[PDB]
Amino acid sequence: KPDCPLICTMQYDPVCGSDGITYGNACMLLGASCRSDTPIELVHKGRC
């Protein structure tokens, strides 16, 4: 599973991550995959 970032931004860059969720940003995901529930990933850089 990926890792976590170091505070990306608030430039709403909603990306659909392999799990079924649109994260505020692919960065906010690294934080998720790091402490969400399972090994998440990225599929589309937008609203799916």
Tab-separated table of C-alpha atoms in Angstrom:
chain	number	residue	atom	x	y	z
A	1	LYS	CA	0.000	0.000	0.000
A	2	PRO	CA	1.146	3.570	-0.805
A	3	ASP	CA	2.213	6.072	1.852
A	4	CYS	CA	1.220	9.456	3.259
A	5	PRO	CA	2.104	12.980	2.072
A	6	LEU	CA	3.122	16.177	3.857
A	7	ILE	CA	0.137	18.499	3.434
A	8	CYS	CA	-0.649	19.121	-0.236
A	9	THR	CA	-3.224	21.852	-0.820
A	10	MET	CA	-6.851	22.966	-0.822
A	11	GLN	CA	-6.987	23.318	-4.607
A	12	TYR	CA	-9.894	20.892	-4.762
A	13	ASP	CA	-8.469	18.298	-7.137
A	14	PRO	CA	-11.017	15.523	-6.522
A	15	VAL	CA	-9.562	12.247	-7.699
A	16	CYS	CA	-11.338	8.934	-7.729
A	17	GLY	CA	-9.294	6.379	-5.857
A	18	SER	CA	-9.418	2.634	-6.242
A	19	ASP	CA	-11.834	1.971	-3.439
A	20	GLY	CA	-14.878	3.873	-4.586
A	21	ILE	CA	-14.199	7.341	-3.226
A	22	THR	CA	-13.613	10.819	-4.647
A	23	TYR	CA	-10.834	12.306	-2.527
A	24	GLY	CA	-10.376	16.048	-2.252
A	25	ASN	CA	-7.067	15.329	-3.896
A	26	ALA	CA	-4.773	12.438	-4.761
A	27	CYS	CA	-2.623	13.789	-1.953
A	28	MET	CA	-5.397	13.536	0.572
A	29	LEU	CA	-5.457	9.931	-0.545
A	30	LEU	CA	-1.882	9.111	0.356
A	31	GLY	CA	-2.971	10.195	3.797
A	32	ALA	CA	-5.945	7.899	3.495
A	33	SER	CA	-4.207	4.824	2.114
A	34	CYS	CA	-1.803	5.440	4.978
A	35	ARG	CA	-4.565	5.261	7.598
A	36	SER	CA	-7.920	4.457	5.989
A	37	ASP	CA	-8.725	0.745	6.051
A	38	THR	CA	-7.085	-0.952	3.067
A	39	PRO	CA	-4.508	-0.429	0.274
A	40	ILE	CA	-6.227	2.240	-1.819
A	41	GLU	CA	-5.076	3.580	-5.197
A	42	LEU	CA	-5.834	6.145	-7.920
A	43	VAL	CA	-7.877	5.522	-11.068
A	44	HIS	CA	-9.120	8.882	-12.340
A	45	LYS	CA	-7.946	12.401	-11.512
A	46	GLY	CA	-11.425	13.867	-11.189
A	47	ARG	CA	-15.043	13.040	-10.413
A	48	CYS	CA	-14.728	9.480	-11.712
